[PDB]
């Protein structure tokens, strides 16, 4: 049921702002791959521009704690799920 | 007719950036509790998206004014306004 | 058909933070303006969320060099985008 699938995806978007938050970086990207994963196979594109919000925020909690190395890791993630976007 | 609804909901979602320039955080707070549920009773997760859209907006507008309880407010609506996005 | 135009106006949204991040304001505003157009005429709310996302990337950028004027003119192209996804 895609349904659950989407409050799956959103689920683990909130969480690629807490871990930011928490300095763990590349777990967060590790679960923004993977709603993009997981978002391209089902066409979801309502739940990569969700990504793509949080994505915005970690960044914001990047800049704040002056991690410059996280932000490139997160601003990877975010033209990956842009590209998806542009896709779906 | 749905597209009314859609324009009526986009008005309140720019109004609580601008109650929120203007300190007005409590008002601000009501209006994105409102515009959650005329969206969630009508179905429309863009009304939602762009909602969530507008309250980033209006979190850089109190993290310039250092009001940090506002901030929290808006962070609780936010966070009210992605599970709706969720089921939506 | 539907993929390739937006595609292009994914990469037209990001090409307006490009220009913002190199000082083209005027350019930037003007390929926003192309893009609602298009948008518009097109019915793709999508690529119209898409551009706000990255005009307020663009409003970052130019706040980094504390330049108002350009924020200005790029916060009424967002305003502009804002209508029209109103009423898309
Ligand atoms: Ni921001």
Same mark, same amino acid.
């Given at each position: 049921?895609?349904?659950?699938?989407?409050?799956?995806?959103?689920?683990?978007?909130?969480?690629?702002?807490?871990? &930011?938050?928490?300095?763990?970086?590349?777990?967060?990207? %590790?679960? !923004?791959? +993977?709603? *993009? /994963? @997981?978002?391209? #196979?089902?066409?979801?594109?309502?739940?990569?521009?969700?990504?793509?919000?949080?994505?915005?925020? &970690?960044?914001?909690?990047?800049?704040?704690?002056?991690? %410059?190395? !996280?932000? +490139?890791? *997160? /601003? @990877?993630?975010? #033209?990956?799920?842009?590209?998806?976007?542009?896709?779906?």
């Amino acid at each position: 049921e895609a349904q659950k699938k989407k409050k799956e995806l959103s689920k683990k978007a909130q969480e690629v702002v807490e871990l &930011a938050k928490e300095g763990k970086v590349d777990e967060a990207v %590790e679960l !923004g791959l +993977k709603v *993009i /994963e @997981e978002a391209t #196979k089902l066409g979801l594109q309502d739940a990569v521009m969700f990504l793509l919000f949080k994505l915005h925020e &970690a960044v914001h909690e990047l800049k704040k704690k002056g991690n %410059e190395e !996280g932000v +490139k890791k *997160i /601003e @990877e993630v975010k #033209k990956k799920a842009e590209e998806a976007l542009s896709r779906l």
